[PDB]
Amino acid sequence: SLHPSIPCPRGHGAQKAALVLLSACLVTLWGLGEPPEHTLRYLVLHLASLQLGLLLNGVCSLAEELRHIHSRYRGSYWRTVRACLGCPLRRGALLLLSIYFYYSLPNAVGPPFTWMLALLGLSQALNILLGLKGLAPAEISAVCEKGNFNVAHGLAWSYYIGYLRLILPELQARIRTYNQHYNNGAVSQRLYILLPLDCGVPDNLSMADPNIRFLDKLPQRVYSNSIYELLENGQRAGTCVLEYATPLQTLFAMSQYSQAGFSREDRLEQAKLFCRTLEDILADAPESQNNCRLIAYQEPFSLSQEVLRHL
Amino acid sequence: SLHPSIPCPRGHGAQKAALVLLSACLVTLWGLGEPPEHTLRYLVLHLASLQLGLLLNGVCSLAEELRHIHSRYRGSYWRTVRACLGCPLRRGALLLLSIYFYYSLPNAVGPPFTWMLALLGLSQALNILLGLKGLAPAEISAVCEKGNFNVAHGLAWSYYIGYLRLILPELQARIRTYNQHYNNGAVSQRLYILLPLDCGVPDNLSMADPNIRFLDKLPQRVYSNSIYELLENGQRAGTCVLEYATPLQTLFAMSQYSQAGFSREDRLEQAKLFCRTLEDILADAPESQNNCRLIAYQEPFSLSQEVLRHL
Amino acid sequence: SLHPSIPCPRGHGAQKAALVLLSACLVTLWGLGEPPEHTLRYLVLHLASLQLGLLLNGVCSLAEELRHIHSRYRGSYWRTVRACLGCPLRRGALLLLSIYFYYSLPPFTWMLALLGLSQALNILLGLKGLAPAEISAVCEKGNFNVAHGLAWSYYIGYLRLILPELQARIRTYNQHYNNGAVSQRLYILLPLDCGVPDNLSMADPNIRFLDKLPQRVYSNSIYELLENGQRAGTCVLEYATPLQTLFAMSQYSQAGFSREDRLEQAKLFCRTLEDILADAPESQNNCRLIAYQEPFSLSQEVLRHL
Amino acid sequence: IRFLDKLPQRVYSNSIYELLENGQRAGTCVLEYATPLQTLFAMSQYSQAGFSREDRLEQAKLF
Numbered sequence: 001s002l003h004p005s006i007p008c009p010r011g012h013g014a015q016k017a018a019l020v021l022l023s024a025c026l027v028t029l030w031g032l033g034e035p036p037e038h039t040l041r042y043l044v045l046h047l048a049s050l051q052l053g054l055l056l057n058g059v060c061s062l063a064e065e066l067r068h069i070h071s072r073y074r075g076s077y078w079r080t081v082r083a084c085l086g087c088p089l090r091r092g093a094l095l096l097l098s099i100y101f102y103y104s105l106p107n108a109v110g111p112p113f114t115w116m117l118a119l120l121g122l123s124q125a126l127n128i129l130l131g132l133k134g135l136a137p138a139e140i141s142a143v144c145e146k147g148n149f150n151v152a153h154g155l156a157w158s159y160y161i162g163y164l165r166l167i168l169p170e171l172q173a174r175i176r177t178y179n180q181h182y183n184n185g186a187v188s189q190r191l192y193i194l195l196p197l198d199c200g201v202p203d204n205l206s207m208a209d210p211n212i213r214f215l216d217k218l219p220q221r222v223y224s225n226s227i228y229e230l231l232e233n234g235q236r237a238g239t240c241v242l243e244y245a246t247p248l249q250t251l252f253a254m255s256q257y258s259q260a261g262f263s264r265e266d267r268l269e270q271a272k273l274f275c276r277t278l279e280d281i282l283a284d285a286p287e288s289q290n291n292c293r294l295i296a297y298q299e300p301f302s303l304s305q306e307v308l309r310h311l
Numbered sequence: 312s313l314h315p316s317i318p319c320p321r322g323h324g325a326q327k328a329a330l331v332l333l334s335a336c337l338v339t340l341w342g343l344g345e346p347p348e349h350t351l352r353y354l355v356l357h358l359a360s361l362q363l364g365l366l367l368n369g370v371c372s373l374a375e376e377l378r379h380i381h382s383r384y385r386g387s388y389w390r391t392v393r394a395c396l397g398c399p400l401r402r403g404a405l406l407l408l409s410i411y412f413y414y415s416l417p418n419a420v421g422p423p424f425t426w427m428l429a430l431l432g433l434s435q436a437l438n439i440l441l442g443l444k445g446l447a448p449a450e451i452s453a454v455c456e457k458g459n460f461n462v463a464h465g466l467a468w469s470y471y472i473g474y475l476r477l478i479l480p481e482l483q484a485r486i487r488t489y490n491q492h493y494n495n496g497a498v499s500q501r502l503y504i505l506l507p508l509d510c511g512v513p514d515n516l517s518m519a520d521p522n523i524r525f526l527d528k529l530p531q532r533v534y535s536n537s538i539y540e541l542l543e544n545g546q547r548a549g550t551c552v553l554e555y556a557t558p559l560q561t562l563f564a565m566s567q568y569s570q571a572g573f574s575r576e577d578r579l580e581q582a583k584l585f586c587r588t589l590e591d592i593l594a595d596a597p598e599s600q601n602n603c604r605l606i607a608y609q610e611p612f613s614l615s616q617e618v619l620r621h622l
Numbered sequence: 623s624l625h626p627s628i629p630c631p632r633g634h635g636a637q638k639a640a641l642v643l644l645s646a647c648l649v650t651l652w653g654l655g656e657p658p659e660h661t662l663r664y665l666v667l668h669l670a671s672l673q674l675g676l677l678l679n680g681v682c683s684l685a686e687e688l689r690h691i692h693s694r695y696r697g698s699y700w701r702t703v704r705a706c707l708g709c710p711l712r713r714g715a716l717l718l719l720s721i722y723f724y725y726s727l728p729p730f731t732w733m734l735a736l737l738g739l740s741q742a743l744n745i746l747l748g749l750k751g752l753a754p755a756e757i758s759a760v761c762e763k764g765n766f767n768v769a770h771g772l773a774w775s776y777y778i779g780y781l782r783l784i785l786p787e788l789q790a791r792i793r794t795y796n797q798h799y800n801n802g803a804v805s806q807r808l809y810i811l812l813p814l815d816c817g818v819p820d821n822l823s824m825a826d827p828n829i830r831f832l833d834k835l836p837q838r839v840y841s842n843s844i845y846e847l848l849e850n851g852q853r854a855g856t857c858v859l860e861y862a863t864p865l866q867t868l869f870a871m872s873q874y875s876q877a878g879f880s881r882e883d884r885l886e887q888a889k890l891f892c893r894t895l896e897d898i899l900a901d902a903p904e905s906q907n908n909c910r911l912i913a914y915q916e917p918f919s920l921s922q923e924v925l926r927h928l
Numbered sequence: 929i930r931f932l933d934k935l936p937q938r939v940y941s942n943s944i945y946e947l948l949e950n951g952q953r954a955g956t957c958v959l960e961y962a963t964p965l966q967t968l969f970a971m972s973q974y975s976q977a978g979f980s981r982e983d984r985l986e987q988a989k990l991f
């Protein structure tokens with residue numbers, strides 16, 4: 001909620017839509033007057049073949065994993081099987097049930113037992129080769145976000161453990177010490193971090209806008225925290241410790257290089273993510289509680305307009 | 312592995328037994344050769360009955376849970392509903408499938424929908440009033456240990472955060488300083504925490520065994536650690552910084568009191584759980600890098616033998 | 623009674639719901655009007671199926687627990703059987719009664735095999751999941767909650783050791799000081815969110831540290847209770863350190879202890895501290911608890927408690 | 929005379945003083961005591977200086 005464009009955490013609208021659809025199907029089934037028993041022999045058997053599809057896709061997925069076992073799966077075969085087939089004991093019954101359900105269930109439409117394995121494997125291999133059963137980008141982001149496999153989440157936490165977690169416990173003492181020597185505006189006790197969404201980070205801050213000008217270097221294992229003041233038509237409307245977010249600077253440099261495999265669109269994906277991750281780490285943080293605030297924006301307006309409203 | 316009587320975390324032998332039972336049931340069902348359509352329909356209707364009974368039980372629970380909305384569930388109806396009925400959308404789908412597969416599919420063994428609902432309500436009411444369907448202590452212990460629902464977990468983590476994490480770093484420096492000055496054997500550089508599983512903590516450590524004798528208290532927020540010299544057949548084989556585990560004494564005192572409702576069997580279970588939790592925490596702790604060594608013993612033997620063998 | 627948001631001990635509204643459902647069931651059975659022998663037979667067979675399912679689940683649990691026998695059951699198979707199957711005699715009698723009714727009332731073993739397969743499926747997948755409300759109810763009834771242990775250890779280790787001499791030390795300081803006077807009660811602060819700063823000034827500038835109470839050694843602090851810039855009260859403020867421990871527990875990932883878990887355990891810690899200190903011999907109006915949560919003026923609440 | 933601000937800056941620190949007349953500012957400047965005038969004073973305190981009060985005032989006039 002820091003910015004109109006920062007993504008929201010994934011809601012349950014998707015499953016809520018499945019409940020919408022599931023009502024329609026049950027109404028349709030009783031609406032068509034189809035024999036209820038024949039309905040059950042198809043939902044289970046069709047899902048039985050679908051669950052048998054993962055076994056064949058698992059073996060194809062497994063054959064490559066057997067060469068990483070000394071390095072990736074700490075030399076254990078159980079981890080190798082667990083990574084490709086999920087929980088073994090959970091999937092062990094579903095395979096036996098799929099075998100038993102198919103081995104005996106009468107089927108108005110459906111191959112016999114030996115004909116089942118013939119057709120099922122061919123589709124599994126064809127999908128692998130053609131990539132037809134690929135991952136949609138919308139669900140690639142959803143799985144990565146839920147699994148926290150994002151370069152942004154790594155940068156945000158490193159930015160916290162390395163830098164913010166170390167200075168903030170002693171920034172209040174350092175700011176209180178600084179204010180005890182100077183008397184005017186007022187130096188805010190909250191650290192300020194600029195978050196240009198498009199990863200546009202100049203090397204210095206005084207080049208960003210003339211309204212923000214350098215004042216002094218806050219006294220300090222050496223942390224050069226540059227305090228700045230704001231200009232509101234020739235008057236200091238506020239002074240605060242405003243700095244850039246180094247990870248957002250490196251994120252821009254990440255996309256430029258040709259060996260990073262980091263697309264221009266991907267940079268915007270992990271630039272908005274870094275702000276939200278840094279929003280919620282500080283919210284629960286003990287040191288960064290009522291001690292820091294973030295300035296997130298996107299230049300299409302002046303920067304100094306946003307800084308003042310946060311003071 | 313501190314003592315043979317400290318339990319290991321619950322494994323997945325229950326799932327293995329479930330797999331064995333499923334295989335045996337499948338083999339028996341195939342051997343007897345009953346019509347598979349009957350098998351499938353009966354199994355589906357049984358699952359439907361179980362799900363609907365769970366729904367009615369959850370409704371009975373939610374009836375009292377309506378008065379807890381403002382306090383225990385932060386005043387939102389949907390959180391209360393999820394707490395009573397589990398996953399809202401998943402349970403909705405399962406119950407809709409149960410409703411369809413009962414109101415449409417036939418059932419030789421099973422009432423009509425209204426009379427089935429009456430019977431199910433009666434059974435749920437009886438199971439709630441008489442508590443006939445209840446959790447055996449094994450499931451309760453398993454759920455508590457998986458979800459960390461134990462007083463021992465709290466005592467162990469409090470012991471780590473409050474006391475151990477604030478002395479283990481400086482204890483090595485204190486021991487080195489005390490060894491540099493007093494050249495009168497040698498002092499071990501690790502604190503040897505005692506964990507009496509019987510929860511018998513006397514005021515004097517020398518009264519546990521005459522061989523353990525109070526030699527000195529190590530010089531120093533005010534932590535007083537007493538080092539004890541160890542007599543092997545009347546000869547001092549050495550010395551080490553030794554002390555009891557206060558949370559075990561507090562556990563015994565809790566057991567004595569009449570408001571804890573914390574019996575001797577429960578006291579022993581939580582004592583062993585606390586010892587295991589402390590072992591795990593100290594093993595994974597970054598501060599305790601070979602800085603402390605737990606000595607868990609149960610009186611069935613001289614403590615001097617065990618402490619020396621660890622020295 | 624401690625605070626509006628503190629969860630009350632679980633009441634018997636569930637039994638009210640059970641009575642309502644029982645009345646509705648009796649009314650509808652009377653209305654439909656079917657031979658009651660068939661209803662009784664179906665009910666008894668349903669109970670027998672439930673008992674057989676419990677037997678299968680207990681057998682699986684026992685197959686799990688057989689390897690814990692030398693640490694959880696003193697090497698006695700009887701304790702393992704009782705743990706996995708409830709009360710031994712009662713459960714055995716129930717099982718034989720259910721099996722006898724199963725054999726008596728009008729496939730015989732095929733039904734049992736199907737029931738066993740269904741039980742195995744429920745064990746593996748987990749459709750017979752434990753609702754979080756019922757988990758909390760069982761934990762509170764049996765007192766397996768972390769907050770229970772934390773509060774009881776806080777009582778045995780810290781509160782019970784200093785309350786009997788706190789009033790004497792306060793009186794000594796009262797002779798040492800003169801006109802205001804410090805109250806003879808300990809005011810333990812219990813922030814529900816468990817966010818405790820190191821010093822009260824950071825939490826609230828309206829509260830000023832005054833002095834340390836005279837003195838294992840125990841150090842306590844007396845705080846100025848400023849109001850409108852004037853001194854309005856003096857009482858001993860001391861954060862409940864177990865709440866700080868709970869926050870640190872929720873911080874680390876090895877605790878398996880979520881944020882809502884921390885909040886609920888904070889509420890239970892406050893409520894069971896109320897229960898301990900309500901009837902304790904060492905609590906004779908020399909200790910008063912403060913519980914609040916910022917949606918704030920702590921000093922206003924403390925003065926209201928004075 | 930009240931301390932108002934420190935002039936921005938080897939390393940030196942100077943103060944600007946709010947010259948108040950009738951409770952209102954009449955002017956501003958940078959005031960700075962002569963630090964030797966302390967050293968001449970702290971000689972007179974010490975018995976090793978051989979530098980008495982009559983000499984302290986007499987010399988501080990020359991300085």
Ligand SMILES: CCn1nc(C)cc1C(=O)Nc1nc2cc(C(N)=O)cc(OC)c2n1C/C=C/Cn1c(NC(=O)c2cc(C)nn2CC)nc2cc(C(N)=O)cc(OCCCN3CCOCC3)c21
Pocket residue numbers: 465466467469470471472473474532533534535536557558561771772773775776777778779780838839840841842863864
């Ligand atoms: C069992 C009590 N309890 N249950 C819960 C839940 C919370 C507390 C609790 O907090 N009690 C507490 N709070 C105090 C505050 C002050 C003060 N003036 O501030 C002084 C006190 O008395 C000295 C305080 N006490 C009592 C003694 C406390 C700490 N302590 C412990 N703790 C445990 O064993 C234990 C058991 C469980 C379970 N969890 N823990 C860890 C918390 N072992 C010790 C052994 C030695 C020794 N052999 O030398 C010296 C100790 O004290 C020096 C530390 C002083 N520090 C402590 C905190 O920070 C500020 C001051 C020891």
Ligand SMILES: CC1(C)C(=O)N(Cc2c(F)cccc2Cl)c2cc(C(=O)NCc3c(F)cc(F)cc3F)ccc21
Pocket residue numbers: 042043045046049107109110111116118119120121123
């Ligand atoms: C949901 C519904 C009605 C449906 O739409 N189909 C698609 C479909 C066919 F597959 C086959 C014919 C018609 C339709 Cl119409 C389906 C299939 C089954 C089934 O049992 N398939 C066995 C099976 C295969 F047919 C091919 C294979 F490679 C493996 C395999 F294991 C059950 C229910 C359905």
Ligand SMILES: CC1(C)C(=O)N(Cc2c(F)cccc2Cl)c2cc(C(=O)NCc3c(F)cc(F)cc3F)ccc21
Pocket residue numbers: 353354356357359360361363418420421422427430431434663664665667668671733734736737
């Ligand atoms: C696995 C098998 C054969 C089995 O063992 N039972 C237990 C049982 C009874 F519950 C009821 C009668 C006989 C048996 Cl024998 C069962 C039940 C159904 C079923 O559809 N039950 C609906 C249903 C009821 F019948 C009564 C009720 F109060 C609620 C309710 F929701 C299907 C298959 C089985």
